[PDB]
């Protein structure tokens, strides 16, 4: 039972076509719950989870306020990164920021994090100590010295260990019936023609939550690690996830194989054969 509260920020310039595109998303575990989009007629922090709908105006006003502050900083940051890297005018550049806190099973802080990317590349990152930074290049180092001078690490550490953790537990409280739920996979194995003497056994895991799942195909104990096709875990769109794993197998010998579904929401590992 591990949790996390993460906020994602993305600023994409678009010269001659408006102010930078700023969008922010907030996540509790594998569930998005808040969002801000600079292009909305009225940019504001808005709920994206049903359990965040009983928060009242004050809450959003505040968040909307903070989001805008950051939005402005990102406008200036874009222009700044543009200079540090001396990029010509008229170009599009992205600035990304993601920070959050992981909460261990014991309910205590597991660790915090905060990092930036520019043009999709690691730029600057707060180290696991939450006191020092990792600057990727001379440009980043400039930012590093500035943040060191402003004692920003200290501020982030405080937020990451405190406020971040406080709101997480709190949002977990709000989202109880869904955030703490753990919808187990609906697993079945499907059969598929492939060749004249070989079929594809596809092991499906449906409607589970959280997204973390383990699918493996095996033949008499031995895991068929190399013959296994795995699809990236995907959102069904309704809050749960899907995933499957397949193996190429000779016709007539399907029954011999077995797939093992492992997921928090299961009393114990599943074993499917066909």
């Amino acid at each position: 039972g591990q949790h996390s509260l993460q906020y994602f920020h993305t600023a994409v310039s678009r010269p001659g076509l408006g102010e930078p595109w700023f969008i922010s998303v907030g996540y509790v575990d594998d569930t998005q719950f808040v969002r801000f989009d600079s292009d909305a007629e009225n940019p504001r922090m808005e709920p994206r989870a049903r359990w965040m709908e009983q928060e009242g105006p004050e809450y959003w006003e505040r968040e909307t306020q903070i989001a805008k502050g950051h939005e402005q900083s990102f406008r200036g940051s874009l222009r700044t990164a543009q200079s540090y890297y001396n990029q010509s005018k008229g170009g599009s550049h992205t600035l990304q920021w993601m920070y959050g806190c992981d909460m261990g099973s014991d309910g205590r802080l597991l660790r915090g994090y905060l990092q930036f990317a520019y043009e999709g590349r690691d730029y600057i990152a707060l180290n696991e100590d939450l006191k020092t930074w990792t600057a990727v290049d001379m440009a980043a180092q400039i930012t590093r010295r500035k943040w060191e001078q402003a004692g920003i690490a200290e501020k982030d550490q405080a937020y990451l260990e405190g406020t971040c953790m406080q709101s997480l537990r709190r949002y977990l409280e709000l989202g109880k019936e869904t955030l703490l739920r753990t919808d187990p996979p609906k697993a079945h194995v499907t059969h598929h023609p492939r060749s004249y003497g070989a079929v594809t056994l596809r092991c499906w895991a449906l409607g589970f939550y959280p997204a973390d799942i383990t699918l493996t195909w095996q033949l008499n104990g031995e895991e068929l690690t190399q013959d296994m096709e795995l699809v990236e875990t995907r959102p069904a769109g309704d809050g749960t996830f899907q995933k499957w794993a397949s193996v190429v197998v000779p016709l007539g010998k399907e029954q011999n194989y077995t797939c093992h579904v492992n997921h928090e929401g299961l009393p114990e590992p599943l074993t499917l054969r066909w």
């Binding site: 993305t10 969008i23 992205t94 999709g120 499907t190 449906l206 990236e232 995907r234 069904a236 499957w244």
Partner: protein, 99 residues
């Protein structure tokens, strides 16, 4: 950094001919965030197409879920066409009930 988008086309619920369902077009690992996603039915654009809020993953690459309500038939084709700078041509992935 420019990364080419990954696409998964699949229904929300187990596909059943004649039963209303939701077709998803999951597009991941792409950058820059500018991208065009279109869902097709027998090669023609599907009007109403819901778009999740774009976000990014661990590696900074972006991802988004585009989806539409649809009712699978044994014969109708469904695809997702994705246009992005990483790709020289639009990427069209068909929905495979089995995939």
């Amino acid at each position: 950094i420019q990364k080419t988008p990954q696409i998964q086309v699949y229904s929300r619920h187990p596909p059943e001919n004649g039963k209303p369902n939701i077709l998803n077009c999951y597009v991941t690992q792409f950058h820059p965030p500018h991208i065009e996603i279109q869902m097709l039915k027998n090669g023609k654009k599907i009007p109403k197409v819901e778009m999740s809020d774009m976000s990014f993953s661990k590696d900074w690459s972006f991802y988004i879920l585009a989806h539409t309500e649809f009712t699978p038939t044994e014969t109708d084709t469904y695809a997702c066409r994705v246009k992005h700078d990483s790709m020289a041509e639009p990427k069209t992935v068909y929905w495979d009930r089995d995939m």
